[PDB]
Amino acid sequence: PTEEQLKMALQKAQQLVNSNPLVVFSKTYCGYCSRVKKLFDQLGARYQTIELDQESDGDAIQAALLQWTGQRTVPNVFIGGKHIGGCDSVMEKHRDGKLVPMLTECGAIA
Ligand SMILES: N[C@@H](CCC(=O)N[C@@H](CS)C(=O)NCC(=O)O)C(=O)O
């Protein structure tokens, strides 16, 4: 990715995060992505999925997410504009009772 491509990809990722209470940066056949989506489904939370493998600038987006979050893998979850992390991170928040209130606070759960 060129520096302009990384910049454009970051802007794209930020706009998605800004315009969705819950965002799941994903890949279509990632088992961990499927797990987190299933959890959110069952919690009644609406999310925007973005499948990097189906985006033309998916590599640039993954590079931008690394720069932005230090994370190299999908799923890469944001809630209310804030970085959550991967499947494990989301499961951790579900485990300590913080996830539903976070999801409610930002509108992801009505
Ligand atoms: N501990 C991480 C593991 C996630 C993970 O390993 N994701 C794989 C996809 S199955 C990945 O992103 N591999 C590198 C890639 O596909 O870019 C989590 O719970 O989210």
Method underlying the structure: X-ray
List the domain boundaries for the chain.
1-110
Q: Counting atoms of ligand 1 from 1, which one is nearest the CA of 29? A: 10
Instruction: Give the CA-trace dihedral at 57, 61, 62, 65, to 10 degrees.
Output: 180
CATH topology for 1-110 is: Glutaredoxin (3.40.30)
Q: Which long-range contacts (CB under 8 A, 24 or more apart) does 58-63 make?
A: 59/1, 60/1, 60/5, 60/6, 60/8, 60/9, 61/9, 61/12, 61/13, 61/25, 63/1, 63/6, 63/9
Centroid of ligand 1 to alpha carbon of 31 (angstroms):
8
Resolution in A: 2.0
